[PDB]
Amino acid sequence: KIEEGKLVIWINGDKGYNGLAEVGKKFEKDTGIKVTVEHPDKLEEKFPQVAATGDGPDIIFWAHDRFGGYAQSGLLAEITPDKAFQDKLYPFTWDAVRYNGKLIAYPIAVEALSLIYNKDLLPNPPKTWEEIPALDKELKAKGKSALMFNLQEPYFTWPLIAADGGYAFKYENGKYDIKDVGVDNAGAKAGLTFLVDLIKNKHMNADTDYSIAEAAFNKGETAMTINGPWAWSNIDTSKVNYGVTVLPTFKGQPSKPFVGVLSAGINAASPNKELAKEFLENYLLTDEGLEAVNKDKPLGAVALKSYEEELAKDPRIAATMENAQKGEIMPNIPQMSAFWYAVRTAVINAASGRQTVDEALKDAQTNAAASEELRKRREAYFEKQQQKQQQQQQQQQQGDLSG
């Protein structure tokens, strides 16, 4: 319980928060209610820490994968859009924000990573990963590199890992299996190996992060990067002649991005739930609301039918979709937090050459399952204690005192 007269909204610093705030100023102008857009760091880690005290914003924006965990900890209010409003959004976007049969967020846009390339350096982009090392060496004769992307976040590395058969959680019998992690298999080991070889062989640098990769591409120093729709604003401004296309194949298989649906959840502790719903339904999720955000930082393939339709002809959104088709929409189950942390640690560890790919992926295999492991052992502990207590009492009733 923190606000009453106003809406505080959290969104990631790489998204169009300036357009979001514009929508806020329009909401204030019509309503009298002040809207404050914030973009703090690590907001997806910060939210569950602050919302569990009665602090935290009224509306949080993130990809849908985190919302399962938030919902499970009781942190999101159930949203109540009517059927008419639901028909305004593509059905599959609604499923991404369904947890235990309840709607826990409003979907905004579908996001997938793509290959972004400088047409002046590289008029034909490579179709496979395997040809990138030779391309990197060729480009050195011009003082350029082939490719730079964010190696610090497993999101950007996942598509190459999943290509030859890496997965998060096997879907089976209408259930995600959470002792069945696919980060340790041969296809995952082949993908990470190839990445680590690129790094060790100096085609890439292990400490390359989001902003270093961005700068290199937007200044014209690298022929390619890998990024989502949000990144296109800055490329336009740099004036680099760029195309957006299919991610390269690995071992003849498509790269498989983990697809995110940018979503808006309402804090369960918020005393402004109705204002938040009003804001989201009638201000943000309209052509004009999404136009404001989208013209700041592109959203991708938007959830709202009428506006997606207005953006239908953009070849960059087409490539986003093609990349989404070859990928999978992320699970939103509570275990996603642990999966990401485990894969982050493993990539960073293998990249720096501290652990082998084998050791690092085996470690992530354990780390991603360790939560359900603890739960199983906790159950067994109390069941065994109950058994011993039962058996000790039945043995103790070998004799009893009587008056």
Ligand SMILES: OC[C@H]1O[C@H](O[C@H]2[C@H](O)[C@@H](O)[C@@H](O)O[C@@H]2CO)[C@H](O)[C@@H](O)[C@@H]1O
């Ligand atoms: O790298 C792990 C990370 O991946 C995804 O986060 C993406 C997010 O979906 C995009 O909206 C964009 O902001 O980049 C992020 C990667 O830095 C997952 O959504 C997230 O839970 C996960 O930690």
Ligand SMILES: [Zn+2]
């Ligand atoms: Zn700001």
Ligand SMILES: [Zn+2]
């Ligand atoms: Zn309907």
Ligand SMILES: [Zn+2]
């Ligand atoms: Zn090489």
